[PDB]
Design a protein around this nucleic acid. Structure first.
Ligand SMILES: [Mg+2]
Ligand SMILES: [Mg+2]
Ligand SMILES: [Mg+2]
Ligand SMILES: [Mg+2]
Ligand SMILES: [Mg+2]
Ligand SMILES: [Mg+2]
Ligand SMILES: [Mg+2]
Ligand SMILES: [Mg+2]
Ligand SMILES: [Mg+2]
Ligand code: NA
Ligand code: NA
Lengths: 189, 152, 178, 66, 49
RNA sequence: GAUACUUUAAAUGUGCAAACAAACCGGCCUUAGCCAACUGCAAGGCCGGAAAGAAAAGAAUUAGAGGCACCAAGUGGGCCUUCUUCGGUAAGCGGAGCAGGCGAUGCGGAAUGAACCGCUUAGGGAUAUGUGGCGUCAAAACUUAUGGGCUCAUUCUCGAUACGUAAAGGGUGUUGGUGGCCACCGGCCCCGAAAAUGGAUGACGCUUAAGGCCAAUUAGUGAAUGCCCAUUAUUCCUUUGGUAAGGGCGGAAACGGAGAAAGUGUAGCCCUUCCGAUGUAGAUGUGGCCUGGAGGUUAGGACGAAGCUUAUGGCGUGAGCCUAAGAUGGACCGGCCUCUAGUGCAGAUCUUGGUUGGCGUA
RNA sequence: AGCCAGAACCAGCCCUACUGCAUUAUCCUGUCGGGGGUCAAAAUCCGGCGGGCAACGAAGUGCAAGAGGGUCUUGGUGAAAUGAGCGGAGUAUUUGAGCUGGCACGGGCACGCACUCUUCUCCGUGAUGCUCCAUGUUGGCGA
C-alpha cells in the first residue's frame, strides 16, 4: 500500500508539470511533538496544556492529530516544544525501539505481538505493524493506539542543539520545523 | 475604602446605548417565562424597580420561580474555593430568553429527521468532503511577488 | 568555502473560498539557509503586500534553483536594509564571484561588517551578472585587465596538521618537541 | 502597618481546586416559592402517594395469584 | 538493532531485506536507471505531442 | 472640552450549553391551578416509542475514580523580578494589579553576589546534553579553517560574558552610501572626559588578535553530529516507600546441598514486575534505638559481676549493639514478653565542683 | 580454585562499517545576429531556433530501509543456551527490479486499483524444577 501511494503521487505531480499546472499536497494529519525545556517557572495555563499533552519531563515525545483544536493548543506553548511532521521510518523506529504499553497500570516494554493483541483486544490491532500503520496514516484507531502507550522518553540529541531560547526560524530550536523534525529525532532515538 | 455602596462604579455599566433610549416594549411584556428555562440577566437602566446587583449583569442562569411580576434565577458565583448557587429575584424587565442551547436542540431535530428518512428509505443527502485534501490547481493569473524600489 | 545561503523559489496562494473561488497565484525568489526560513519569508511578503495570512493560505511549490557553471563574472546586487536612526536604505553594489548564491552571501557578510545589519533586516531586490563594460567601480574594473599578474607577499603558511610541531631546530626541520 | 495585597490568594484557592456547583437536581427545595402553586402541588403529591400504595397492593395480589 | 527481536516483531523483514539487496545490486541499478530515463523522456515527448 | 469628554472600537478576558436522576415522540390518572370553556395552558405522576449513545464538515485531549465528613498544627512582620501603573525632583523610597520566585535550596554557569541564566535534588557506574566556553592560569581548535569585512588606541584608558556601576558638538584618521568635485547619512577610532592609600576586560597578556560584525565543521570533494564541563536526559546495579500489580505455599517420587511461615510491621514466608524519592515552621509512623524500677520467663558469675581504658575489630542507612585485650577491678548481673517513670544535653550573662592560657608576667 | 594477572567463547548493551528513490530547465550544448575588447581574436553579456542527462563519485535538493571495536560501563562457561545465531531435513520457496493483458489519472499513460537479474526455506526440546546456592583455560604467589 505504501509503495503504491508514493508512485501514484509521483505520477500526479508529473502530469501537472507537463501541462504547467500545480499539484497541491494534502495537509499533514499527524504531528510529532517533543518537550525541550525543564520544569521551572512555568505559568498555570502552559502548565495545564503540557499536562494534558502528557509532556511532563524534558525530552518526552508524543504523536497528536494535526486538527484545529490541537493546533490551537500547540500554539500556546510554542517556547517549550519542538514539533513537526514525521516520516514512516521515524514512526517505525520509535515503536520498535522506544515503545512501551500501559498494562495493569505499569510501563511494559514491547517484546512480542501477543501482548499487543492482549492489550488492545481488537481485530484491527494485533501487531506492531498494525500500530505503525494506524499512527502513520491517522486511521480510525489513532486515539486508541496512542492512548494505549506510555509517552516516549528520549535521550538528548547527540551533537547538541543550536539555541533553546530562540525560534527555529531565528536560528534557534523551538517551534514548528516541518519535515526537518526527522533529522532532529534521528539523533535522539 | 472610603465609599462602597450598592451601585458604586456603575457609570458605564447601567447606561443606555447611543440613540437608543426609552422604555421596554410590548415584545418584552408579551414574553412567556416558565420554570426551568435558561435566561440572560441584563439590567435595564430605565426601569429602576427590581434591578439586580451589578455583579449579575452579564450572567446566564435557570429560572426557579415565577411571580406576578418577578422572576427568580439561580446563578453560579465562585467565592473562595467553591462555587455557590445564588438565588436572585428581579422584575421581568431585566431578563431575556437565552439562546445558549440552540445548536444542541437543532442537532437533536436533525437526528430525528435523518432517522425518519432512513426508515422511509428516502435517498440521503450527499455528505460534505474535507477541504484539506490534495488536487491539481489550474491557475488563471500568475504574478511576481517582489519588493521594489517604489515600495519604500 | 561554499555559500551559506541557497536560492529558493516559493509559489503560493490564498486558500479558495466562496468570496474568492479562484485566488491569484504568486511566485517568490528568496535566499535563505533552509526551506523553512524560505517559507517564513514568503508568508511575510504575502502578509505585507497582499493582506494574506499564512493561516488562510496554501503553498503550491517550494524548490531550490540550481547554480550555473562556475565562471568568474561580475554581479550587480540591489539590496536594502533597515536601521532605527537612518531608516530604510537602498544600495546597489558590484561583486566578483562565480555564482549568484556566492555573490549574495558576499553581500550579506559585507553588510554585516560595514553597517552591522543582520539577516532578518535585509531584503534583496535583485541580483544579476553584468558585462565587463558596465562596471563603474575601479576596484572591480581592475580585474578585467588582460595582463593581470601579481606576486604573493607576506604569506602565513602553516604546515600539514600531522606535521605541526611546538619546538624545532633553528636552521633545520627536525622537531624536538611534537 | 496596614498592608493589603492579593498576591498569593489565587494560588491558595487552586490547591484543592475551585469545586464545581452542586447539580440542579439535588437540593431542589421549593420553600419561598409563589404560594398558590405550591399549595396545589401539595394536593397532587398526596393523591399520587395514595395511588402508589394501591398499585403496590395490586402487584402483591397478582404475584400471589401467579 | 537486534536480529531476533526484529524478526520476532516483524516476520516479514527478511523479504524486505532481499528486495533491498536486489535494489543495491550494481547491474540492476544501472539497467533500471538507464531504462527508467528512456521510459520517462519518451513518455513525456509522446504526451506533449 | 480646553482652545482631556465622546458617537466608533480592539488584543488579552469573562457567563452559559454541547443525550444515561437529562432531553425528544404518543395514551392515561390527578389538581378546592389559568382561561368564557376545554380535547388549550401550568404542575406531579403512570403506560409506550426512539436512541449515527452522538455521523459527515480540521469536528478535542488527559501520568482523566466522582462525592461526603470528623479531629487538629503552624502562620496572620515578608521581600525580589516581568508587564501595567498612582504619589514623589529622585531614591537600594512609599502604595497597588497579574504571574513567577527567594523565604523553606542546594547543584551547574555569569571571576564575586538570597532573587539573573540552566536545571530542580535516594546511593553509585557508563553514554549524551543545557547555560557557558575552547592562548596560559583551567577541561576543550597541542594558537581550527584549504571563511569575508573593519580597527591603532602614547600616565584610570582601544576593546572584549546580558541582568549591572556619559551627552550635545566636532575630526579629511580611516572605510561606504545617497542624490547632484560637491552637500548630506552610516561603520570603527580620536577630542569633548577633572579627586582624594597602590590596583584591576578576574590576572598575565593579546594587534597576519587571544578585539568588534557575520558565517562554518575538517571544506566548490562529491552528502545529518569539531571539541569540553552538571545532583538534568537515556541506560545499568543496589536501597527504601507505595491508592502498588501478578504468581507459589495438599511437601511430585526417589535419595549435589539447603529452605519453603496463608503472611500490616522482623534477620522482611518466597519469587517476579512497575512507579516515586530534596525541604524551614508543622503533622504522623516505626516487631525503631537508649536509662532507673515492677510482674513473668530464661541464663551468667571468685576458672572473676558492675564500673573504667582502646591504632579491639565485627554488625547496623542511623540511634546503637556485640566480641577481643587490660601486664584493670573485686561482688553482683545479662536476654526476651508485659507494666511503670523524677527516662537521653553543646550552648539558658544557666547551677555546683575542679582545671586552664595570660605568667615566672604586672 | 584462596589471592593476583592474561587470553578465548556465549548472551545483552553501546559505537563505527556497508544505501537507494525522487527532483534538476532561472540549467547544459550548437549555430545565427548584436555588443565587447585586442597588437589581431576569444570571453564576460543580450536576443533569435537546433538538440538535450553538467550524470565518476553531477548537485553538498527532500526522504531513506544497507557483520569490525569496547564492556576493570553487565552477567556467565551451559545445573531446563528458544536462536535468521543451537540442532534435523532440500535445493526449492517468494521479495523486489525489467517486461507483460477492466476501472481510475491527464489533454496519452511517467506505468495507481483488482485478477531476465535478484535472495536461502520448513521443522524442534514445559517446569513431577516452589525458592536459593553450587560448573571453564593459562601463568604468578602461597608446601
Ligand atoms: Mg549551547
Ligand atoms: Mg527566559
Ligand atoms: Mg522566617
Ligand atoms: Mg534556584
Ligand atoms: Mg587545557
Ligand atoms: Mg520494593
Ligand atoms: Mg523527605
Ligand atoms: Mg528530668
Ligand atoms: Mg554534660
Ligand atoms: Na574573564
Ligand atoms: Na526514679
Amino acid at each position: 500500500e505504501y509503495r503504491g501511494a508514493e508512485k501514484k503521487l509521483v505520477t500526479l505531480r508529473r502530469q501537472a508539470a507537463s501541462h504547467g499546472n500545480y499539484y497541491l499536497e494534502a495537509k499533514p494529519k499527524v504531528a510529532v511533538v517533543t518537550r525541550i525545556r525543564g520544569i521551572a517557572k512555568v505559568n498555570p495555563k502552559q502548565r495545564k496544556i503540557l499536562q494534558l499533552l502528557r509532556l511532563r519531563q524534558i525530552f518526552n515525545t508524543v504523536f497528536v492529530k494535526m486538527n484545529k483544536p490541537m493546533e490551537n493548543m500547540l500554539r500556546a506553548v510554542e517556547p517549550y516544544i519542538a514539533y513537526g511532521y514525521p516520516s514512516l521510518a521515524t514512526v517505525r523506529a520509535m515503536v520498535y525501539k522506544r515503545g512501551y504499553l500501559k498494562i495493569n497500570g505499569q510501563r511494559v516494554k514491547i517484546t512480542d505481538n501477543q501482548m499487543i493483541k492482549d492489550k488492545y483486544n481488537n481485530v484491527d490491532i494485533v501487531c506492531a505493524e498494525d500500530m505503525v500503520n494506524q499512527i502513520y496514516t491517522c486511521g480510525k484507531h489513532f486515539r486508541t493506539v496512542t492512548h494505549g502507550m506510555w509517552p516516549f522518553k528520549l535521550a538528548p540529541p547527540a551533537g547538541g542543539m543550536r539555541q533553546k531560547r530562540r525560534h527555529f526560524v531565528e536560528g534557534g530550536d523551538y517551534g514548528n520545523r516541518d519535515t526537518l523534525i526527522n533529522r532532529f529525532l534521528a539523533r535522539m532515538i | 475604602v472610603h465609599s462602597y455602596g450598592y451601585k458604586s462604579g456603575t457609570r458605564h455599566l447601567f447606561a443606555k446605548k447611543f440613540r437608543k433610549h426609552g422604555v421596554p416594549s410590548v415584545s418584552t411584556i408579551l414574553t412567556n417565562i416558565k420554570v426551568g428555562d435558561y435566561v440572560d440577566v441584563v439590567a435595564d437602566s430605565a426601569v429602576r424597580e427590581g434591578m439586580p446587583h451589578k455583579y449579575y449583569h452579564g450572567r446566564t442562569g435557570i429560572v426557579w420561580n415565577v411571580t406576578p411580576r418577578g422572576v427568580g434565577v439561580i446563578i453560579n458565583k465562585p467565592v473562595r474555593t467553591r462555587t455557590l448557587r445564588k438565588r436572585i429575584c428581579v422584575r421581568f424587565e431585566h431578563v431575556r430568553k437565552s439562546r445558549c442551547q440552540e445548536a444542541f436542540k437543532a442537532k437533536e431535530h436533525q437526528f430525528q429527521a435523518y432517522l425518519a428518512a432512513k426508515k422511509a428509505g428516502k435517498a440521503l443527502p450527499p455528505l460534505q468532503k474535507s477541504s484539506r485534501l490534495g488536487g491539481i490547481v489550474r491557475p488563471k493569473n500568475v504574478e511576481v511577488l517582489a519588493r521594489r524600489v517604489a515600495d519604500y | 568555502v561554499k555559500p551559506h545561503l541557497r536560492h529558493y523559489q516559493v509559489v503560493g496562494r490564498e486558500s479558495p473560498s466562496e468570496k474568492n473561488p479562484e485566488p491569484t497565484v504568486y511566485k517568490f525568489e528568496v535566499f535563505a539557509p533552509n526551506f523553512v526560513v524560505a517559507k517564513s519569508r514568503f508568508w511575510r511578503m504575502m502578509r505585507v503586500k497582499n493582506k494574506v495570512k499564512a493561516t488562510h493560505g496554501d503553498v503550491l511549490s517550494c524548490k531550490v534553483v540550481k547554480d550555473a557553471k562556475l565562471v568568474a563574472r561580475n554581479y550587480l546586487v540591489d539590496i536594502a536594509y533597515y536601521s532605527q536612526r537612518c531608516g530604510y536604505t537602498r544600495m546597489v553594489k558590484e561583486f566578483r564571484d562565480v555564482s549568484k548564491t556566492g555573490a549574495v552571501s558576499q553581500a550579506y557578510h559585507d553588510l554585516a561588517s560595514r553597517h552591522r545589519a543582520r539577516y532578518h533586516n535585509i531584503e534583496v531586490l535583485n541580483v544579476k551578472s553584468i558585462p565587463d563594460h558596465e562596471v563603474k567601480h575601479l576596484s572591480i574594473a581592475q580585474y578585467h585587465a588582460p595582463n593581470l599578474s601579481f606576486p604573493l607577499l607576506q604569506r602565513r603558511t602553516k604546515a600539514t596538521r600531522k606535521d605541526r610541531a611546538i619546538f624545532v631546530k633553528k636552521n633545520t626541520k627536525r622537531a624536538v618537541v611534537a | 502597618s496596614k498592608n493589603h495585597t492579593n498576591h498569593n490568594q489565587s494560588s491558595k484557592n487552586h490547591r484543592n481546586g475551585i469545586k464545581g456547583p452542586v447539580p440542579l437536581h439535588l437540593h431542589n427545595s421549593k420553600r419561598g416559592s409563589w404560594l398558590p402553586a405550591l399549595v396545589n402541588a401539595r394536593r397532587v403529591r398526596k393523591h399520587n402517594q395514595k395511588a402508589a400504595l394501591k398499585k403496590r397492593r395490586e402487584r402483591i395480589a397478582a404475584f400471589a395469584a401467579k | 538493532k537486534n536480529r531476533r527481536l526484529r524478526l520476532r516483531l516483524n516476520p516479514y523483514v527478511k523479504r524486505e531485506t532481499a528486495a533491498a539487496k536486489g535494489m543495491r545490486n550494481v547491474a540492476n541499478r544501472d539497467a533500471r536507471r538507464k531504462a527508467k530515463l528512456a521510459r520517462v523522456t519518451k513518455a513525456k515527448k509522446a504526451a506533449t505531442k
